[PDB]
A paper describes a structure:
Exploration of the salivary gland composition of the rat flea, [name], revealed several abundant acid phosphatase-like proteins whose sequences lacked one or two of their presumed catalytic residues. Our data revealed that these flea salivary acid phosphatase-like proteins have lost their expected catalytic activity and, instead, have adopted a role as scavengers of biogenic amines and leukotrienes.
The three-dimensional structure model of XcAP-1 complexed with serotonin was determined using X-ray crystallography data at a resolution of 1.75 Å. The crystal belonged to the monoclinic space group P21, and the asymmetric unit contained two near-identical XcAP-1:serotonin complexes (r.m.s.d = 0.230 Å over 356 Cα positions). In the current structure model, the serotonin molecule was found within a pocket located in the α/β-domain. The entry to the binding pocket is formed by the side chains of XcAP-1 residues Phe111, Asp227 and Asp231. Notably, both Asp227 and Asp231 form salt bridges with the protonated aliphatic amino group of serotonin, contributing to its stabilization. In XcAP-1, the residues Met9, Leu228, and Gln265 show good shape complementary with the serotonin indole group, and the pocket is closed by the Val294 residue, providing support for the serotonin molecule. Interestingly, additional interpretable electron density near the putative catalytic site of XcAP-1 was also observed, in which we modeled a palmitoleic acid molecule. The carboxyl group of the fatty acid is well defined and is oriented towards the substituted catalytic residues, while the hydrocarbon chain extends into the interior of the pocket.
Numbering used by the authors: 2 to 356
The structure:
């Protein structure tokens, strides 16, 4: 009945570090960060959660290299996270604390993976940045709500450039981990200061992926394109493309940084979409730590449909996305048609990034 599930999950918590493209706050690079002990447990819990949600519905008798496919973006902390989530599926306690080989870490890739990061890579997609800066009117109005807090942050960390919209978002996420992990030293980030920065971050990132057709295509179009490439085979009884386990592989788990959850949510919420039968606000949909998007494919006799379930963070209840004009279980061809507008192929995306 349930035949196949895609999961994309934000990676487990890692030692607070600066983002590439972010301001220098920690003076250590997040790309060098270990998962925290909490982050390893969170990643493992996700796999235990997913097994309980889906193992028996998918007809899987044993989670192993044939039955699930753990993938991740090209960052150690995301790759470690995805493999630990796999350990949770398998119920392999000791692999949670494994020091995964460089080899086991690289073996979490798939062909379209790196293209998913093109739109935020410096110099690689200038048209995406032109189109984000074109929304400066709305950005200024949003930032006007938190500019006092940004000024206090910049007072302590002068590298934060309020003129760079991503610096406000990336400073908030950096400070959020720092407050969690070192609370004694973080008493200056009060509840009101962080909640204020969080609102700015939510509104900026949601604007950056949904305000215009070009922002939606460039940030999320390749996600749709690869998903449909896969579902065109699954819906014919064939294996997910490139899945190591072939037809045996019933679950794909993709561990990412926050920006790809945001982009994936945006790609699944064209105008008129609902989350639990209500319009969404930027603040409510902002994917926190522990967030994941679940893409469930159903088959009733010969009829395939797709259901989209979103968990916005740790301990948050799942909510179901409904596309405009479709049901919770949206028949496959209608679902794909509903999402054609902002889908884009790799060849098209490279041209659209540069033209
Ligand atoms: C979530 C959509 C992006 C919002 C605006 C970003 C603007 C310009 C791109 C530069 C920022 C680099 C992001 C790095 C994020 C990461 O690696 O986790
Ligand atoms: N090949 C499918 C890549 C991909 C795109 N979006 C996804 C969401 C979840 C997932 O497991 C995977 C994906």
């Amino acid at each position: 009945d349930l035949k196949f599930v895609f999961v994309m999950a934000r990676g487990g918590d890692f030692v607070a570090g600066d983002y590439a493209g972010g301001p220098k706050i920690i003076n250590k690079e997040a790309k060098d960060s270990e998962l925290t002990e909490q982050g390893k447990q969170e990643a493992f819990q996700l796999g235990t959660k997913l097994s309980g949600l889906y193992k028996t519905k998918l007809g899987v008798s044993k989670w192993d290299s044939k039955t699930y496919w753990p993938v991740a973006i090209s960052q150690k902390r995301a790759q470690v996270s995805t493999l630990i989530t796999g350990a949770g599926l398998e119920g392999d306690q000791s692999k949670r604390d494994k020091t995964w080989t460089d080899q086991e870490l690289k073996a979490t890739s798939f062909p379209a993976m790196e293209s998913f990061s093109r739109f935020i890579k410096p110099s690689e997609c200038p048209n995406y940045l032109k189109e984000l800066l074109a929304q400066q009117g709305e950005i200024t109005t949003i930032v006007k709500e938190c500019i006092s807090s940004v000024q206090q942050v910049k007072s302590k960390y002068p590298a934060v450039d309020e003129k760079m919209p991503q610096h406000i978002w990336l400073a908030y996420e950096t400070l959020k981990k720092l407050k969690r992990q070192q609370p004694s030293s973080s008493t200056w980030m009060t509840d009101d200061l962080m909640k204020n920065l969080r609102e700015c971050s939510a509104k900026i990132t949601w604007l950056a992926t949904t305000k215009t057709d070009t922002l939606r295509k460039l940030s999320g179009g390749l996600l749709l394109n690869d998903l449909f490439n896969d579902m065109d085979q699954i819906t014919q009884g064939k294996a997910q493309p490139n899945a190591p386990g072939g037809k045996d592989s019933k679950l794909n788990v993709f561990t990412v940084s926050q920006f790809l959850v945001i982009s994936q949510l945006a790609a699944f919420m064209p105008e008129g979409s609902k989350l639990n039968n209500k319009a969404v606000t930027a603040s409510d949909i902002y994917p926190e730590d522990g967030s994941h998007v679940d893409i469930e494919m159903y088959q009733e006799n010969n009829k395939w449909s797709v259901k989209l379930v979103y968990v916005s963070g740790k301990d948050k209840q799942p909510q179901t996305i409904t596309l405009p004009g479709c049901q919770e279980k949206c028949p496959y061809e209608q679902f794909k048609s509903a999402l054609q507008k902002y889908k884009i192929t790799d060849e098209e995306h490279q041209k659209a990034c540069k033209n």
